[PDB]
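Case study.
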Amino acid sequence: EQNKDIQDLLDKIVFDAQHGQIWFDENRMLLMHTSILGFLRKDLYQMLGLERTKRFFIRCGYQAGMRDAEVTSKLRPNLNEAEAFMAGPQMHGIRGMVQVEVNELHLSHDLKQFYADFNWLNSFEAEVHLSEFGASDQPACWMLLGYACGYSSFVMGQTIIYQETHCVAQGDEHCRIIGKPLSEWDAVSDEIIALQAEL
Amino acid sequence: LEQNKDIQDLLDKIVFDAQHGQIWFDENRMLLMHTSILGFLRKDLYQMLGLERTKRFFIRCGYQAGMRDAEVTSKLRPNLNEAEAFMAGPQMHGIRGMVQVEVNELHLSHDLKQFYADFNWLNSFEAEVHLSEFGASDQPACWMLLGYACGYSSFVMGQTIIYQETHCVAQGDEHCRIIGKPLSEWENALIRFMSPDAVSDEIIAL
Ligand SMILES: [Zn+2]
Ligand SMILES: [Zn+2]
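After joint prediction, the assembly is written out as follows.
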């Protein structure tokens, strides 16, 4: 019914409580509290400063994003590029991190062309950021953003960089990102962060 | 179908809302994550801070999570005895995909201030992660699980329960093992955060 489009991702996810294991394909998952992420964000901040913490959370999202794309790219290979790609936004929702809503998506692997304009609703990272830091001067959704780039870059076979254009933690109403190839704008965390120092 | 009779009161409270990007455990949001966030964290801190501060950090982060599950399951089993209610922490640890708890021994009394737990830990996510980043250890490596056991147990018992991991897959045993007793019964010897910080340094001196 409500899951027609994600059932193939659901079928890959196994909860085996009695043996202490959650599997997404052949990868272990953990169920964690968002407030623990908030705690870890704050503790790293104190120990290492904002840049290193930001760099940490983006790198993590980035590897997670690439891992999910390894797993989901084997699925759907009898479908067209947009439907396949949508596994990424879909995992973010299944994982409980954010709801992706597509304003605009243009993509072709062979053309090396990509452009995404998405809204992010109920970002967990904006919530835990307000909680620990109060209202922010900059977008807060570092991990989610890393995951966007990583997932997107694996699927397209080149560096796709995203920018969080509007963020719930800066008072905006929903979060929103725009994704394009590096040029139209791997330590790509440097780029994402450099990129956001563009007023 | 349901030999989850044990943990149904816990699963009952888990709600997945994939359309809306949300997972709930009671009123708390949760996430499903890759172990790589922790594997990364563990690598980054090992080289920026060294082993001792890395290990303290993970015990701290397990301790906060254990305490939190204790908060959320506190009022959960009023018509079972202390033990079967305590079992929620071990059970959550399994529900969360972290480790599987198999009891060798468990006796507790809140009011007699008595606690002994001897548990096998099987399938430790943390032992896998330590191995695939650091290889074999000369000592037990399940820091964050140990932190959890201690934060959870200390809350439930209203006092300092310290655990020791006497065997660990990370150092080539076949499963991990732990003994937990009150701080007063170990053969060696203000703010409410400041108390956690102390407990966390104690579970760290092994
Ligand atoms: Zn945001
Ligand atoms: Zn271990």
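Observations recorded in class. Chain A touches chain B through 51 residues (CB under 8 Å). The radius of gyration of chain A is 17 Å. We will return to this complex in the next lecture.
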